[PDB]
Amino acid sequence: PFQQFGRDIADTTDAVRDPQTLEILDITPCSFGGVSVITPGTNTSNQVA
Amino acid sequence: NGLTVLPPLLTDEMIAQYTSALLAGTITSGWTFGAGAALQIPFAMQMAYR
Numbered sequence: 164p165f166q167q168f169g170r171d172i173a174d175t176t177d178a179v180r181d182p183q184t185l186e187i188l189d190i191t192p193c194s195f196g197g198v199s200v201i202t203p204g205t206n207t208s209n210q211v212a
Numbered sequence: 213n214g215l216t217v218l219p220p221l222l223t224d225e226m227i228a229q230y231t232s233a234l235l236a237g238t239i240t241s242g243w244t245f246g247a248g249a250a251l252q253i254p255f256a257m258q259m260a261y262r
């Protein structure tokens with residue numbers, strides 16, 4: 164009843180109580196990752212994925 | 213938190229096919245699949261060899 168937010172194993176906040184209702188929301192971080200370019204040799208084609 | 217984990221190139225299912233292949237070569241053909249094509253030999257005679 165008194166708890167306002169929750170944490171993952173290593174410090175990071177992973178859930179919050181909405182202060183107006185009582186709902187508990189999980190937080191997922193922004194989607195992110197490496198852009199990687201898959202290519203034949205430029206000697207044979209210029210199409211890439 | 214800016215950290216990313218990348219998958220292995222070979223899945224656990226693909227590794228389990230290679231460990232089945234090495235095992236099925238070893239059972240049916242002794243060491244011969246390490247020298248060339250697998251040559252079948254009866255398993256009692258492969259142990260008689262070993």
Ligand SMILES: *[C@@H]1O[C@H](CO)[C@@H](O)[C@H](O)[C@H]1NC(C)=O
Nearest residue numbers: 164180181182183184185186
């Ligand atoms: C806050 O107000 C809303 C209506 O706007 C109400 O539905 C909600 O139960 C209230 N929560 C409390 C008691 O803080």
